[PDB]
Design a protein around this nucleic acid. Structure first.
Lengths: 143, 58, 63, 181
RNA sequence: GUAUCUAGGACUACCAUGGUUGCAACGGGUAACGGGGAAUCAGGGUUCGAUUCCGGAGAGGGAGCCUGAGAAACGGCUACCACAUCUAAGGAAGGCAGCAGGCGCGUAAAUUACCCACUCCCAGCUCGGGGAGGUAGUGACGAAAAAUAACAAUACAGGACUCAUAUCCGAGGCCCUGUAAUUGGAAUGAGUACACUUUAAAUCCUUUAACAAGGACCAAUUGGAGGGCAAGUCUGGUGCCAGCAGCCGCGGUAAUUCCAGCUCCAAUAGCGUAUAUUAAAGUUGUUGCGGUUAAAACGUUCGUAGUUGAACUUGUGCUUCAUAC
């Protein structure tokens, strides 16, 4: 059944695995490496960007809300992003077309919750660390 | 759709905002591990409560 | 306290000690402290020495 | 470099962070030995494994083997000098019966409390911080000194310590001045 | 044969038609310097190695070459290209992937400090030189050690305890335990600073005279409390809204998830978040997967490569001692 079970078949055993790790869906970001092709930043971790709009992405069914996201154009490459700003409020902390450090969204490439197809998350807007703004633990830059 | 974002941060605007102001600045590392012994042993002698939970309020 | 180890170098005579005598390490009981530089400006006078030949007596006015 | 600050990372975090009985065991150590943080207990627990993974490996060598002795009993030289194994159960099979608590019972935080110098399960534990403990010449600030069994008898007090009686306050001696002045 | 330090198609001359590959030649890709090694599990392994040591290359680009024992050198020169400077306009000069810097780029990287005292290198040299090397400032990349109280009666109740009396019950209760901005006793070092020491010099640590805690003080945080998964069916607000949420799900007007408050939990000078990677993964499987129906046996057979191929060809006897008994 199956394997080349000889003792002088380690050529077939390595050329088989070499040809059949392509069907390991997650080891096709070692092989074909589409990171520099399909990721919005060229394989990095974070990204500085410049906000272009305020997109009210509505929630997917069977949850009704409106997620209040933000459409970023970066400065790294001139890709486009629809990022996301969490924890209610803090669209009031945007002060539009002022720069943003967006980040990955923790499901490694997919949208997470009821957000349809939005893959990112604001972590710093105008360099003041948004988690230190719901408490207003640091001062918002206003003037 | 994007019908309105004009209700962003709504329930924070409907919050009464009472305060903390007190509560007795607590013991840190080693002494904090001292203080987590009375809250187990004797209170709570594992008496029969007929399938209940220990850190309950009511 | 009660333990403080160290080194001790009993020479024979001071003038025979006046041969070996690590001077920067002698300098604690050095009676012989000379020629302050202090090693950052001596380069700058050396580099200007390279641009005058033969006499090298014009860099009194350069600091 | 070069060789920059060569690792030996202790502090083994466990696999699953909230296994309820694993959590109900740690405070059954902290009351026994007045330890501060929990990764102190993972510090000593990691020390047992490098013993055992050395210990259990020797039992896969077919006695007589050269490796099973000059590394074998040399482990057992340490485990009796540390004051943990007895002399009857000297052999390599019995070293695997060492619970975590047996290393903890040679901590200075218990070897000053099992001696009468301390009278409390935490006054021991802070006495070593404030330097009133001598080991044969040397005062020791660190309570994780773990005591070898040869140096058991020399746990006594510092001479410059207020116990037994050198500059006994000295803040209390200033408190012996602020009352009269 | 020429050239080279030298072999050599290294090159020229004639002559031969050879070489190479399914055991992957040749071309392509590389977010490729190679190794020592690093990460991570029980094994088997995947992943990483620009980076201190070794070997190699390069000094904006390509090319060229002098001096030399040694350089196709760039803190040598020569062109050209690019970039750029001082120019009185004729000319002249540029090379930080050395150190410390400055601009840029970006999510992402320190001070234009000190010293040759160390390690060693160098010259004519014991002495000179050496931002090599060393010191220092910066520095939660990292790794180690460990400060946030300790003790005491009353205390305020639980509990044994002696005992009344017992489905009750109290007192002699008490080793205990907590609560006590009750009371104390206060035990000490972060501070603190003479002077020391350390050092090239100076600092840091260690010693240190003086100075240093009733907390309000010398005052830990960061994440969470539906499940996974440790820990409130606590109160108020909001009512499919705001939000939460990795996954499964909560909110559609009594929210165990939302905004809070009280509480509570987990680690703790540490913790959250992202991407990456590894283990979980017997979900890449040689050890070790699966293929009737869940994904998966070519329509059939033939067949080179390859893989894999039955049996048989000096084996115990026989006697002894060394040798277990």
């Amino acid at each position: 059944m199956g394997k080349p079970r000889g003792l002088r078949t380690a050529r077939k055993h390595v050329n088989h695995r070499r040809d059949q790790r392509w069907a390991d869906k997650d080891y096709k970001k070692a092989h074909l490496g589409t990171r520099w092709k399909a990721n919005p930043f060229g394989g990095a971790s974070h990204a500085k960007g410049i906000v272009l709009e305020k997109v009210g992405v509505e929630a997917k069914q069977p949850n009704s809300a409106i997620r209040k996201c933000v459409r970023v154009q970066l400065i790294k490459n001139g890709k486009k992003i629809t990022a996301f700003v969490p924890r209610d409020g803090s669209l009031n902390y945007i002060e539009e077309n002022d720069e943003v450090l967006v980040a990955g969204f923790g499901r490694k490439g997919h949208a997470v919750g009821d957000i349809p197809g939005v893959r990112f998350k604001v972590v710093k807007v105008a360099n003041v660390s948004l988690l230190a703004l719901y408490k207003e633990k640091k001062e918002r830059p206003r003037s | 759709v994007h019908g309105s974002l004009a209700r962003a941060g709504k329930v924070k605007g409907q919050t009464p905002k009472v305060e903390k102001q007190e509560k007795k600045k607590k013991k840190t590392g080693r002494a904090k591990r001292r203080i987590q012994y009375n809250r187990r042993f004797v209170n709570f002698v594992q008496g029969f409560g007929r399938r209940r939970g220990p850190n309950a309020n009511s | 306290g009660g333990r403080s180890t160290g080194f001790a170098l009993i020479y024979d005579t001071l003038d025979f000690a006046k041969k070996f005598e690590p001077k920067y390490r002698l300098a604690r009981h050095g009676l012989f402290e000379q020629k302050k530089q202090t090693r950052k400006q001596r380069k700058e006078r050396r580099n200007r020495m390279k641009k005058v030949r033969g006499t090298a007596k014009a860099k009194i006015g350069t600091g | 470099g070069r060789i920059p600050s060569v690792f030996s990372k202790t502090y083994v975090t466990p696999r699953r962070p909230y296994e309820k009985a694993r959590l109900d065991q740690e405070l059954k150590i902290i009351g026994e030995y007045g330890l501060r943080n929990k990764r102190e207990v993972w510090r000593v627990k990691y020390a047992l494994a490098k013993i055992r993974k050395a210990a259990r490996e020797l039992l896969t060598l077919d006695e007589k083997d050269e490796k099973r002795l000059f590394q074998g009993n040399a482990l057992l030289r340490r485990l009796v000098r540390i004051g943990v194994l007895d002399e009857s159960r000297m052999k390599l099979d019995y070293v695997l019966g060492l619970k975590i608590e047996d290393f903890l019972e040679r901590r200075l935080q218990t070897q000053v409390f099992k001696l009468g110098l301390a009278k409390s399960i935490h006054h021991a534990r802070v006495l070593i911080r404030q330097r009133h403990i001598r080991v044969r010449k040397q005062v020791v600030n660190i309570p994780s000194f773990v005591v070898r069994l040869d140096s058991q008898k020399h746990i006594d007090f510092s001479l410059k310590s207020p116990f037994g009686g050198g500059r006994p306050g000295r803040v209390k001696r200033k408190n012996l001045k602020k009352n009269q002045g």
